[model samples]
Target: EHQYSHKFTVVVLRATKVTKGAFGDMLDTPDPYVELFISTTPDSRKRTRHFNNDINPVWNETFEFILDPNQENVLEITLMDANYVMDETLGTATFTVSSMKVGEKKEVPFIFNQVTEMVLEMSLEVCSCPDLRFSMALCDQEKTFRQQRKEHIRESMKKLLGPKNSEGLHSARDVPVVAILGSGGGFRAMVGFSGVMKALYESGILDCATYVAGLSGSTWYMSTLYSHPDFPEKGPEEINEELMKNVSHNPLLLLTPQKVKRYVESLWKKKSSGQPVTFTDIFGMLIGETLIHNRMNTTLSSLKEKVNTAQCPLPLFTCLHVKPDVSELMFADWVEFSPYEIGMAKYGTFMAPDLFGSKFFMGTVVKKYEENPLHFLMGVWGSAFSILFNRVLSTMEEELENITTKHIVSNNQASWIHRMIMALVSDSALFNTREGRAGKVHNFMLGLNLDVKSKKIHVVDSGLTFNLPYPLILRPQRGVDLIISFDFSARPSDSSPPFKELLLAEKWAKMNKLPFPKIDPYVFDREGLKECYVFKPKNPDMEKDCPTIIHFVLANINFRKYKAPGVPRETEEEKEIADFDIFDDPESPFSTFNFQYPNQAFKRLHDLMHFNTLNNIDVIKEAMVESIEYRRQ
Candidate 1:
């Protein structure tokens, strides 16, 4: 153990002033809180009292930390704006005991990601509490929760397959640890995931899965289904049907006054709190971009009930982080969310899901905790197609321009109110970085740092880069033996995204020093790429090193000549079906006026997508058997 222990006292003195409070351009001050991280050890952390809304929050309290210091050991002091929910960052400073004279009080001027500045006074001393250090090591290093969940998933997976292996078709040695990945493509991807799950459950193949992960719109469906009590034991068809029962209740447009009120208040609050607002937060979010029904707007906590039953596979939703002008393929953040926790490997942070919005700095929760509404969180998860939202922004900006001459101003209540809204939407995106905003996604408070990085992070559907979540599932620790992927990207059903993503993932894995099955890109026959395929890479120098891959692509053409792919627009046009543009397809199962439409067409699209998946079930089972044959050591 490389433990170089030190007991350090950190004093929390009030900041003399804070520049650029979160309330952009408004005369407001932050409720500053201090957080301490040794940054050398796993859990060397401490926090100060969250001073109520004030520019000068004087804690005058001190907290001691017993930390194991590293080569670059120093106390990282991060000051933040505190709220019961997501706290905003003010600024930060760093100092070492070696550099400072112990107990000699010092004042440090703090500056953050912007030109904003503030000052704080503090003193440090060596102090210790055996129980405190013991607690740090225990709580910081313990794997109890992660281990418990992993073990639970393993056990549940075994049960899912219990009925299938009744005849010992595959022994314990060859049991597959499966994951089903859902990626984003708006309603098409959402509907496809739902129909596919219904089909899998019907065929009993879904039970064999250990993990179910989705990104963007597909998460909308997952949030709804996983909340159902029967989700673990019963097929998803029941929930899926119930969820789709009222197509007219689309969040695509705020059809009700309640929807409008919440939507306005949410954006207003974020703005007041100094968080950036965007049209995506409006059009994409308030449009009811989730599977949650209007009658019973469920909360994320509702998942606790279903998860306690331990009947369903672990659920995961994915997000990404990128800077403006940065290609997502090259600089992806790869964030993961589960009912258990929310975090990003790239950022080197993790926290309980309920505490996600609870602000943290230097790995310490510095604010009181409060949960965001299910719909607000939905705004976050379903915020894909950033460009489309921006299109709405540009269109509206022009409309305002038409009404007012050269109204280029900010915070001019009479003039720039609408202008400010447009500015916020554009600024939250890549406007300053000056790049095309196409193919980017919106950022959320959970992933922002006013001081550390750009407040405006470019997050988009991971599918924009890859149609599947193999990057997460392929993580070696899971030892995933197989992947059950359902892709519904808008690209042609047989396009190169899946194949290219596989190649890209392999390269990315190697560059990042992660384990990945050898990808054979040449093996993909173009036509075969449009259908389901089972791939068992030839064993490496060491066998059993890589999991088998079961890849499925979406195909509206999966039917016989007379049968259609179940689109709601009653269109036979190939482009409309493939594009899944409910916007253009006036009669789609989506809400046309207020987001309700294509009723019979909606049911048909569901049934068509459902049947096509079912028709391939027998083939997929055979592929699993083949994988077992190849996997035998």
Candidate 2:
């Protein structure tokens, strides 16, 4: 009379990380092994390899359990120290059968008796296969996560708009979509986002935000923060300050020899498993490191609980992936990421988040494709043109490597190898996909000899061409009534912004006949350093409300002159010269410094950016109010 009839597989992998081993007090190393038992089963006891003399032992074994309908069983494991005469029970642990999903694997840690700290890492997995693809899809189109989020967004709007009576009760499509978009500049954009988020949170804007989207470096921060456990319900209160003292400029934290050794082993393991390892993989190892990278891999899925229960803003991380055969950065396919979905807008093709890494036939039904790691997805989302070259190769090489590696890279770029690598590789083809990928791959018959392989598609930073795109925010599907564009790009030598981004946005919108606010050429840049321009709908007869927009240009506030108030009087001559320079000063935001930096310069750069956002808080706030009010009209 078993209520449920099913069989599950339990995998017993090796356990390391337990520093001390063996029968506790007399520790040399314990020849450790494990036994698994199923409480409900009449005969479901399995034993692992009895190895000797090591606290950290490898027991690659597999077992199974059979269950019946409505069956409730306890999966239990006992660790033992195998001795000459008898085996001593070292530790025991138990898990509920219902606690896990079928076909998916999760690692559990068991502690030893005396040390209390020694851990035996074990993995339990269900053998079912049908739900695998659905598990991988991060997003769902059918109001699954979107509706939960959009409805929550209505709460946010209600928070901002006051009453929810009739005027506040708008359809999901007609609801005001608030997007806080970030641009690219490596850490500069990352730092910019912190300041931006801080302002939004403090200004109550983030509290009411429906979406948070970013490009390149912007995606970097948004991805990490949203993935963080403290997100939404908790505050990013000291993020910028804490980053300065601990995470951002710290060096040993990023690449001590030991960490690098571990990282090398990690990468080796990934490749050995038949996964594609490229500059994206390597660069991610450098920037995010394996720990953070792996954490991110499960971040989205990990947040499913909080996301469903709590009113988490739907985050859309973006990047552009161009076909290797083409160089049109402008035409790069716009890829977006939400917990529910990640796909390219160009092909109108997308897959559930869980299925994004999984394979597809013709475009929908899922097939087997190993789920990609978070780093790989980050590489794809933040992939910029020239991809790998900019992040890793450009990693503080000798003057010779830097000088020889410009655009021609042709100007004696022959010496253009990073002193770090004398690095490998190139090709005009064989990038990453069948159709073609972003970065240069090898030419089987030409210079670099690598060729076609893994089905993984390569992508890079969208900052390559369009610095500020409206895909997630302006797309008619989301019905964004307002968007706040934060431009944190570096000072390109040019005196004026080509408005290359705006023009392309309109062009893309035109192709869809979607409502995009048209604008005069020079209207956006009227104000000096702090350019605040509003673009509104030109056609009064548009079907949906065309979103109003407010753009913010980063301007250094000369602490000495007119420090606080928004100044339109400062001429071009007053423009302060600044750069991400770090070598000379060590604390420069633009510097190549890794982790911890001097508190002095760290606070300096933080305050420099933080204050600017604070100063313009009212301006940004007012824009949101005006836009929302306008949409109602």
Which candidate should be chosen as best, given TM-score against the real structure? 1
| Each prediction's RMSD to truth | 11.4, 14.0
Tens-place lDDT per residue, model 1, 1-633, is 122345455666666555463464264456667888876533457778776656656677766554433345687888777766787766667877666555667776666665545555655554332211111111231133333354454344445435564334325444556678876555666666788888877766665666788876677678767766566666676787676764535433333445545555655765554344444455444434445544234555566565544445667777655444443354566767666555565444555556555443233333434454455455555544433343322222133224211111110223333345445545444133234332222122321222133323544445545556666666555566667777665442234445655566567767776666676655665445455666665645553456666667665444533233343333466333344433234344432112343445555456556766776766666655554454465
Q: What is the lDDT of residue 334 in candidate 1?
A: 77
* Worst-scoring 10-residue span by lDDT in model 1: 404-413
**lDDT on C-alpha atoms for all candidate structures:** 0.54, 0.54
Give me the displacement of residue 436 in model 1, in angstroms. Answer: 12
Superposed model 1: Cα runs more than 4 Å off: 1-174, 233-235, 255-261, 267-277, 287-290, 293-304, 324-328, 346-348, 390-458, 492-530, 539-544, 561-597, 627-632
RMSD of 2: 14.0
| lDDT (tens digit, per residue) of candidate 2 on 1-633 | 111235566677776543334445365456777788875643467788877776567766777655532557787878777777787786777778677665446666655554533233333343232221222223344256565566666666556555643253454344566777777655656666776787677666775667778776677677667666566656556545555544445433344445545555665655554444454554565555522443645544454544674366667777655454444555556767776666655444455555554432222222334555555566555544224343333232231122211221111231233322211212211112222223221111111111123234445556655567577676655667777777765443224453556676778777657677776776645643443456767656657467777676655544324334454336544334233332333334453212334665454445455556666656655665566556566
Count of clashing residue pairs in every prediction: 12, 36
